[PDB]
Amino acid sequence: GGFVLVHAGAGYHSESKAKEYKHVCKRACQKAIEKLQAGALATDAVTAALVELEDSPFTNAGMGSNLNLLGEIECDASIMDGKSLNFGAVGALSGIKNPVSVANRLLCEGQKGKLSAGRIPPCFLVGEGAYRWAVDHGIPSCPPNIMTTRFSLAAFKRNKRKLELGTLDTVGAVVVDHEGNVAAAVSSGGLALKHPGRVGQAALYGCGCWAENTGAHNPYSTAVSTSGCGEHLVRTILARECSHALQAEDAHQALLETMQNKFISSPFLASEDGVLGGVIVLRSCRCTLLVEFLWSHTTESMCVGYMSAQDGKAKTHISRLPPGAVAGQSVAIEGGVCRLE
Amino acid sequence: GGFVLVHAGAGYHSESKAKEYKHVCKRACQKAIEKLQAGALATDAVTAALVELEDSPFTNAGMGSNLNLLGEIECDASIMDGKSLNFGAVGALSGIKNPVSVANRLLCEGQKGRIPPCFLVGEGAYRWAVDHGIPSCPPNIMTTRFSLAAFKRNKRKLDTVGAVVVDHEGNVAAAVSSGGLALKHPGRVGQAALYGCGCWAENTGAHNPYSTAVSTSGCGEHLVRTILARECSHALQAEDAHQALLETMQNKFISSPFLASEDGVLGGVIVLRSCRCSAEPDKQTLLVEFLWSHTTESMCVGYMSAQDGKAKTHISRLPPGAVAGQSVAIEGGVCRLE
User: Fold this and answer.
1) Which chain A residues touch B186 with a CB distance below 8 Å?
2) Which of A73, A247, B224, B319 is most buried as measured by Cβ atoms within 10 A of its Cβ?
3) Nearest residue to B229 via CA among B190, B264, B269
4) Do B120 and A235 touch (CB under 8 A)?
């Protein structure tokens, strides 16, 4: 009993490179299910998925991240637990191989702080301090020669040159365990030639991801993860906005109206010539657990992968805008249902 | 014409330091009004107010901010413009005397503006500030005799600021600045730097009949988990502003499921709500409703109307019967701007 849905970016996935994108999404789903079947917490499950997605040298997160203006790697990552509603995140973090692991550990410590442990522990750390906290907590440090790849280094030089004259490939995942507990996480390398210290949506509470279990004013346990233009997702606090919209009976219609009204037609992005973003969503309710999963995006395409523990084989797919639709002006949306024991 | 409301923290203001807090609030308001009258933008006005608030050795923001675990100063600050809806923010910033001025520069550059950065942290935010003409500030200038003694004290083991403004056309702006928790771990970023949590400013639009501006104070974590600033803005779109804010503080803050594990929720907000109530097509009047609410023992505020030219200061305190962290105090008023 368990379900996972992951994504490897919302932007453009060429037919020639589609294969690679889907393969990492497949592996990420398996890592997540393994954790669930092994009795792990939902958060540890999404973290396992994200570690796999970050580790791919082809994703703008962890190893392979876009090099900033100075040719350095600074990552943003966050995670949320639907049961405890606790959160963990890091921004402008360099020197660490798996940013999500740090965000996960901040979340874990935060949980330890609830059982009477002085003032609330930090949920958000950035830069040098985030690095120090990671190391001091036993998290593996990673050298620049390992975080950087020949290709990212080469893109850096090109980008620099183009100034004197891919980045949308971020990652995310959502999971629901057999008890109905959900969790979500997101990780990113940020904009390709960003100014040092720039923090994007992947580190911001409510913007990058969201996870909230069923409650008095929350009939469904919901989890959301985002991708696309970081700035667009932040100004609209998209993840949380999608989670709240999903409380409506018709999930597909609620997500569609959100992407159209609260995103594309949002007054907060009125000055933009095209709004770019995508989301993966999970909604669950106890009856067995009925799970509804969906993905929506305004980008050319979005790579997704999902898997049910009882089913066994991951399904991967590149969602594309239909003929006629225009990237940044229209919305693509697809989904399905699965019942868990 | 214009109106401004500021706060010098939500927590506890001793009767012996009251006059000091109120005084800083008076100057901040005067600073903002002087800007408005000089024809400045609402964001420039709220920034001027925050600079004054920050510059006080009595406030946990800018100079005088709490020293962190390593005895160093790291500030959080943000600002939002209601007309353009643009935002500017900095987190874990050191070496800069006025964090809010850096956030205001980020917002301005964003307006001139792929989209420029609206949020910078650490060394990067520092570099950016210096590169745009804002001189650095050595440690001794931003460390007061009180924060140093406090640090040594602390190591031997809520005075944050904000402001909301409305110009003569009805454009609103909001800003917030904080030094964060005393002895916090390096890199810890709080509510004052996060979009939706620290402040919020949004002019009348399709989904919101009222122009609203919100600034917060109190326990950083509590304000973040509930994304209070933005929640208040949305609540203020209801017909009855006073009742809406009260219900928000009661249900979405004190009774929020996101803070259930806590024994007492601590925070306060200052809000401004505006709409055009009349015009003479043959001159216009803005109805401005302003409020402040809190669950802490007290909250220090100050407000001023350009037309009245008389700054008003006040320390809101929980009355007998109200328990800090469990109750909600709320006060407000209304004024018209011609």
Assistant:
1) 128-129, 132
2) B224
3) B269
4) no
What six digits make up the tokens of B92?
């874990």
Among A125, A210, A257, the strongest candidate for a mutation testing the B interface, having the largest count of B CBs within 10 A, is A125
How was it solved? X-ray
Catalytic, A170? Answer yes
- What range does the domain containing B24 cover? 1-338
Residue with tokens 């949920």: A123
Which residue from A76, A10, A1 is spatially nearest to A45, judged by alpha carbons?
A1
Q: Chain A contact for B130, CB < 8 A?
A: no
Q: Which residues contact A143 (CB under 8 A, 6 or more apart)?
A: none
User: Looking at the complex, does the CB of residue A267 fall below 8 Å from at least one CB of chain B?
Assistant: yes
B108 touches chain A (CB under 8 A): no
Question: DSSP character for A140?
Answer: P
Cα nearest neighbour of B201 on chain A: A268
Question: CB distance A128–B186 less than 8 Å?
Answer: yes
> Do residues A289 and A310 lie in contact, with contact meaning Cβ atoms separated by under 8 Å?
no
d(CA B92, CA B96): 11
Q: Is the Cα torsion angle A254, A260, A264, A265 positive or negative in sign?
A: negative
C-alpha B195/C-alpha A7 separation (Å) is: 25
Contacts of B131 by beta carbon, 8 Å cutoff, 6+ apart:
none
Beta strands A289-297; A332-340: pairing state: antiparallel
Parallel, antiparallel, or unpaired for β A171-177 and A182-188? antiparallel
Q: How many domains does chain B have?
A: 1
Out of A47, A59, A148, A170, the active site residue is A170
Alpha-carbon distance of A112 to B51, in angstroms, equals 38
What DSSP character marks residue A218?
Answer: B
